C-alpha cells in the first residue's frame, strides 16, 4: 500500500463514486455528482499510466465507465432513465471496485 503517494484511481473512485452516487442517492442534485464525476471521466479516458489503475475498464467496462460514457445520451436525452441505471452501475461497482 502507498507505493509513493497512495494515489491510484480506485482510491479516487471509492469516494469519487461516493461523493457522486451520494449527490444523487439522496441529494436530488445529480448535477452535483456530475461535477465530482466530471474529472473521473477525464481521469478515466486519458488512459492507464503504471499498471494499477486498470481494474475497472478490464473488470467492469459497463460500470462507471459506461455509466458516464452515456454523456452524449445524458446530454441530449437528459433523462433520469439513464441516471437510474448509472446509479446501479455506480452502486453495483461501489462494492466491486471496492474490493471489500
Distances (CA, A) of 85 to 31, 62, 64, 93: 16, 11, 10, 12
Distance CA 43, CA 20 (A): 15
Q: How far apart are CA 4 and CA 77, in angstroms?
A: 42
Contact 60, 96 (CB under 8 A): yes
- The set of residues, in sequence order, having a beta carbon less than 8 Å from that of 85 and lying 6+ positions away, is 67
Alpha carbon distance 56, 67 (integer Å) = 12
Phi first, then psi: what are they for 39, rounded to 5°?
-70, -25
Q: Which of 49, 58, 27, 22 is nearest to 37 (CA)?
A: 22
Domains of the chain: 1-100 (1.20.120.150)
Amino acid at each position: 500500500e502507498l507505493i509513493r503517494v497512495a494515489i491510484l484511481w480506485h482510491e479516487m473512485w471509492h469516494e469519487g463514486l461516493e461523493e457522486a452516487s451520494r449527490l444523487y442517492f439522496g441529494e436530488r442534485n445529480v448535477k452535483g455528482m456530475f461535477e465530482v464525476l466530471e474529472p473521473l471521466h477525464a481521469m478515466m479516458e486519458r488512459g492507464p499510466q503504471t499498471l494499477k489503475e486498470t481494474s475497472f475498464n478490464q473488470a467492469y467496462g459497463r460500470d462507471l465507465m459506461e455509466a458516464q460514457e452515456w454523456c452524449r445520451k445524458y446530454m441530449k436525452s437528459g433523462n433520469v432513465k439513464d441516471l437510474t441505471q448509472a446509479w446501479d452501475l455506480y452502486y453495483h461497482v461501489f462494492r466491486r471496485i471496492s474490493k471489500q
